[PDB]
């Protein structure tokens, strides 16, 4: 497998190419062209063309057709967009079919049909003379949009921010990550297939520092930077940026709790926390990796979860009742492991897993890790604060309601909060006070496309989501007529 | 021992203090505090802690009953607030009347009453099991708004972020520019003499760099910077936020243009231009230092601005006429003074002004400049393309639509633009071309507060006013509640 | 005392009187002056007219400000307010002092408010040349308002119409009910003394057919007809406008449902539907006339209920731990005992009340009747279906819960209905499910003025409140700007 | 060729028929089968029942899908839609081909994708124990909806009522015009070809008096009617629905002007008044009947639209250059010709027109009448003042702006306006001072699905379009959690 940077219409290669590896057995995918800082410009150049174009001709109902018409594209190679995602991560076909491929193309749909009903503002004003005034807001397209997305959930979270900075008629560079390039790569063979007149959408690959990632966020050129991915990066291109004083959307880390109260229903949040903590091998963002449980019930909510975990599946991403695959790379799994020794050094018990499974066959090579459990840790310990980003979480016990309040928010972190309860005004009191950006109510990872999205603290700036989206992908101007 | 801070609910001094000086005469009005990095901590501390007192417990319509004492607090003490603006910056004593602290007034209770009006959203969602689920959003405070202020209007700007971070919960620490002090101080006795809770309106002195200014800039404790001053200064505090990732709001520098056409009103379009280029003396935002206007009513356009522009009085705030106060300090002076050579030097025609008046008495002491017309030079020159924040305007000819609108928008600022004229096509078809924030048509510097204020490219960064501050100065959150 | 008509600015008198009755003692209170045709044709000519003076020349905050001038002016004379209610109704001077005044005020002020946070819509559309077009909408007055409001909680719903009216910049022709014409007048005072220009708020006493209602209702000058009473009545009105197609918004009766499940708080629920059945003795449209009851704890709950409602003090106004007062009227009484006979004819055991209380002084002379709880009737009795408006309840015990809902909602009424549940998932489960326009969980008659208020069915049309008001009181236009 | 009704998921026929007649020549169409009161009750209980089915447990993305199934069914049959309306109206088929069938599908679309980005509000409030309440409003179908559509833009009319019908989830029955049953009776062919559920849609045949029209008008099992006809219509309709309070939507009659002011676009203006007059040979509810010329361009205005005039091409629907086809039927031909006559006997002056064509052919025994132009008659003339609805205008001359406001708003309808000018200022200050639901500047007919739809007095009752059908065709609730 090749492949290529898509710039101004054309499929490209580079001078440096870099390999994507199958973290199921460790094996070579396909060589990746990386762009470099000559081709970055020639991305971003060809973008604020496009802009003069007959895409910035069309009409709202046009653009809107046509990104329905990319959505098409999507859905008639569906499976071809599954064997991709999986063949990059490792995650469960299973989960590509049924979250991943069907999302991508949910995201380009909404954004476009946003687009069509979405209108501005109009105020009235009384004047001096007394003849009055009208203010008028129209949304236009905010110029290019620089897009660098993570490995977790690389076509979904990809198209999250393709799809809106189209929607709104912008033009885009986007880097997806090293770690994950071919459904993106696929994206642009659908682009262009579908006529997306060139410059409109530039795909550019490579990493973050000294590669297209930092070129991107350095070119003068662009309009905005939306990012998803670590906090520490996210500071990083926020300086990038601010000379440019470019508009900036940022989701990123997270150490996100899950409480469960007496009065939960405790098979049903046994079987929540099972999910939020080790979906796609916990490398979610969303993911729980904090879990408190009230005291009264704290031991056989440990033991349940224990036995649940212990009967997940880890294995190939198509084996018959898969839960996990591996994680996204060796890289990651140094990292994983490092913080699973250091959690046995900070006094943890280990109720389960901490280690790496034993197949016996090729999967010996790729990069797996087992489901872990952890217990006994003080709040400051660092395996409770720092973000892993691996299928586990500590489980420590709680007894009054402001206490565990304060504890789910004394955190660097804020992005989100799951809670169990039966209790009407519990669900209810408690939520309104966690410092979050998304709390849900005995379930997890539920997702209306027209809700605002992001974090607070370190955890990111800015909401995108429906009108949220709408907002940060277009520029907002009032224009004020004296009569 | 004059302007003192005011930190958790009392007014203190500080271990340096500077000079406040009269612009009109270049006397000492007073000696201010300047805050140290380690009151600068105390002030974010005690806003801390206010969010956790009777503030944080007051329903949204007392926090807004609370919010229209103070500004009846301001109306109380009227002439006080327009003596202390005018010493500061030398501002007519007619325009505070009528302009400034009306409208600081004006803040308040916007921003009260729209607290007050403002709700969220509801999402009903379909599930699997067939349930169903909702998504609710609320508004919450931030938490610590941090406020860093410019000197041109001093307390309209100021209140503008303070009314909002208020309306919304928010506790406030904020720094208002070294060069005008005074009117913050006041709005600090207000504050506490209408029981606004300790720590919750926290007023800091000093500088920028390496004073109270930065300090505010890297304090962890915060949630939010908004800032109001020069391009330069958005990127230098952008960096300085970037490692906590803390919300910002930035508007920043213009170089703006008016627009002039052959069937525009001349009279109206030579009085509306004369104020746009020398009210405050040049020394808002939104002026026009760049004016275009067609070449078949060029000349009588120059000719008549010049004689309005030459009728002008410029003087003591409480001269019977007069229309133009001094520049807001030497330093500043000196700068605007450059530029007058500068233009020189590139080749401008001075049609009037370019130098400082001679006054033959203590006014010779201030800073005042002449208000300045510039005629013949390019659009690449640099009096024609960098920020002055003088009493000035270059003035060029142009031929087509698409020309003018071209080189209005040839510029890395993008704030604002006026265009004169009395076509209904022209005036919609080329208003929405500009790439700005905010456009005029047949005025200029009309506000209403509802309305989506900010810039574009260098010129900031987001918007304020209406619901754009009521989200900007919250914590939006949403809230899943599976059923 | 002396109740006159308001008309273009002067109180007026009338070629008949009608009595105004205490109902506490039968006692004469005032007499009052009854429009006639050519008055009420007098009050409407007079509003279309003062659209064009000075009211209809106020900026919008100056309209909001002149509103909130009236509010200031009830304030001023609060107790007076109190007083005039009690008179009228025999209403408990502390339901009148905390409730009934505050409320009226609150609903001034409230739209005044949005009256100026309210703003409108702009809308881009391409056409077939490339140039476009642009569509705003404007919220203009309606014009003259009739207003027609009932006895129950007179200046509370007079002002509830009167309010957004002139909010709106409407003018207003308003006709209070025969039995509660007190409070109204005095607010004529007000308008009068806070400056309200002539013909702006007009104030016809009378009845309905034959008198000042249904002349203001033929009246061919007004603009809308918005009406709280019965049913039948609307009906009747709405034949009324129908030759004038006059725009039309209708609350009218009900026969609401309090739900209580097993796992309600039951201490509490007793309570609520305490007061839910027995507030302002059983006459308010809000109130629940008819209870279900899980079997589990039925027998235990009415038990609760007989005994608080046994605790209930009836007497004076000002008599001390006073909790209900008389009917509005002999003639409401002898409709509601014949209720009470009529549900014995039925069936029903009565739990308590079902007569009238003995006073042995002037209250005998009064309007009183017992607080009264029914047992053992059908749900297809006519004491169970028809609103009976009288402090009564039929309790009936259910077992499930899709029963319950869909006995809820077999009713030709749908306005309210309150539901008691500690539960999550069956609190927002079954709200959804109820056919009406207001559901209540765990409280009772909780009004927040921003919320769309109403009924389906028998209960009426339309919907007042926040933006509902402002759009249901102004004239919304379109206007379509070629480009 | 026969057009029955269809009635939970079945075409049936009925005891009576009555002939559609093709209005170009007077020959028999079809037999169309009328419905009797018996099968209206069929009809309506077989969509209760469907609130009930599988149609009621859609989600709102499964019934948006189905609905652009509806659309999509029309697409594929486009011709025979074509055909259709052509057959029964006598429409161009240039029009029906680019107006009539694209706006019928684009209704439907529109309100799908509205129905999916649409959403409701939450409201926090604070209460007395100090834990707080939960206000959020939900939207639900309100049940049946009756829709009486005209026969003038059959299925454009038609499909904008059941469009947001369906979109909010309600079921329907629909009663087309006598005149133009052709295209509703396709459309539920392609709703049954799509699948839609028995019940959900049902298609009703007749008149009104005495038959379907009025049948459906009385049933109580209805939750709405929403209608398109004469206001005398209307207000039939209105009190017959006034025992069951049914919400009601009215889109009546109008007496549109244009307004052509000395500084319009002249040739650009008589060009807009031919199009506003005589499209669809004058029948469209929007059309200009009469119109005002600024005096110092009345007589070159006037010739110039005599010119114009009469090159129309009158003729079959699919002739070579065709503008105008015949009137809808012999019936309204008798009318308009009444009209033509009446025109002489108020003091006319017949510019053109004024009577029928002669053909010499088949077209003899249809409706047709020639495009008609008066002068000289005064604004109480009955033929200034009533509705005619044929190809007709008169022209009169003004001198002043205010004068011609009046003159315009001098009438019992309020639908429409256009104005003609290229003033900027004349253009917002004229229109917003017109008395109408929509206004128009320099052009006319321009529709944006998003904006509110609707008259003043005796023109209609509510918005329909965007927001304003989403709210009208939905039971809006408001649910309440004490916390
Ligand atoms: N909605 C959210 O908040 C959300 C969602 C998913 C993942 N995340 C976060 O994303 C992280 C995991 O993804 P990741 O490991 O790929 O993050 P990674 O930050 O370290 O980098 C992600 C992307 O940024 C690029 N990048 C790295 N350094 C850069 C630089 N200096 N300049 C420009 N670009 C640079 C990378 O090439 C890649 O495309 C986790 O921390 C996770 O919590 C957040
Ligand atoms: N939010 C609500 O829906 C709400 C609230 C409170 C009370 N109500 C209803 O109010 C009713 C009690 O008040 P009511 O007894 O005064 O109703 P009442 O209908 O018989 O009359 C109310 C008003 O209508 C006038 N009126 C009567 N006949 C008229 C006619 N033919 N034409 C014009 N006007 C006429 C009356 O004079 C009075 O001013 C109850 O049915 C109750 O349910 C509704
Ligand atoms: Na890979
Ligand atoms: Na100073
Ligand atoms: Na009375
Ligand atoms: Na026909």
Not at 33 to 58: C, M, R, S, T, Y
Not at 222 to 237: R, V
Not at 241 to 249: I, N, T
Request: proline share 4%; hydrophobic share 40%; charged share 20%.
């Amino acid at each position: 497998s090749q492949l290529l940077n898509y710039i101004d219409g054309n499929f490209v290669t580079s001078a440096s190419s870099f390999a994507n590896i199958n973290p199921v057995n460790g094996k070579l995918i396909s060589d990746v062209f990386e762009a470099d800082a000559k081709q970055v410009n020639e991305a971003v150049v060809a973008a604020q063309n496009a802009l003069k174009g007959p895409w910035g001709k069309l009409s709202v109902q046009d653009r809107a057709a046509l990104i329905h018409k990319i959505a098409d594209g999507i859905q008639a190679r569906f499976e071809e967009f599954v064997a991709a995602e999986v063949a990059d991560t490792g995650r469960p076909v299973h989960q590509a079919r049924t979250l991943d491929i069907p999302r991508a193309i949910a995201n380009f749909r909404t954004f476009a049909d946003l687009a069509k009903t979405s209108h501005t503002d109009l105020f009235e004003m009384s004047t001096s003379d007394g003849s009055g005034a009208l203010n008028y807001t129209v949304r236009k397209p905010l110029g290019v949009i620089g897009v660098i997305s993570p490995w977790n959930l690389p076509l979904l979270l990809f198209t999250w921010k393709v799809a809106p900075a189209l929607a709104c008629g912008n033009t885009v560079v986007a880097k997806p990550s090293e770690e994950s390039p071919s459904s993106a790569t696929l994206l642009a063979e659908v682009m262009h297939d579908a006529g997306v007149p060139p410059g409109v959408f530039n795909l550019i690959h490579g990493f973050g520092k000294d590669s297209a990632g930092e070129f991107l966020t350095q070119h003068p050129g662009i309009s905005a930077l939306t990012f998803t991915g670590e906090s520490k990066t996210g500071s990083t291109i926020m300086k990038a940026v601010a000379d440019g004083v470019k508009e900036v959307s940022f989701a990123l880390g997270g150490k996100n709790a899950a409480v469960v109260f007496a009065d939960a229903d405790l098979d049903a949040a046994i079987e929540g926390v099972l999910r939020s903590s080790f979906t796609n091998s916990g490398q979610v963002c969303l993911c729980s990796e904090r879990v408190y449980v009230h005291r009264s019930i704290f031991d056989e909510f440990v033991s349940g979860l224990k036995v649940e975990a212990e009967r997940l599946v880890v294995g190939y991403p198509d084996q018959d009742g898969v839960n996990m695959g591996p994680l996204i790379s060796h890289g990651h799994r140094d990292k994983v492991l490092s913080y699973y020794r250091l959690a046995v050094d900070e006094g943890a018990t280990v109720v389960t897993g901490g280690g790496v499974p034993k197949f016996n066959d090729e999967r010996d090579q790729g990069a797996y890790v087992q489901p872990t459990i952890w217990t006994g840790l003080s709040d400051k310990a660092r395996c409770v604060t720092e973000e892993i980003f691996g299928p586990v979480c500590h489980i420590s016990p709680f007894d009054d309601e402001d206490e565990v309040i304060n504890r789910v928010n004394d955190s660097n972190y804020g992005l989100a909060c799951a809670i169990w309860t039966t209790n009407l005004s519990r669900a209810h009191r408690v939520s309104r006070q966690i410092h979050v950006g998304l709390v849900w109510v005995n379930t997890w990872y539920l997702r209306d496309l027209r809700t605002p999205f992001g974090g607070v603290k370190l955890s990111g700036l800015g909401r995108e989501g429906g009108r949220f989206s709408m907002d940060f992908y277009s520029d907002i101007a009032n224009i004020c007529i004296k009569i």
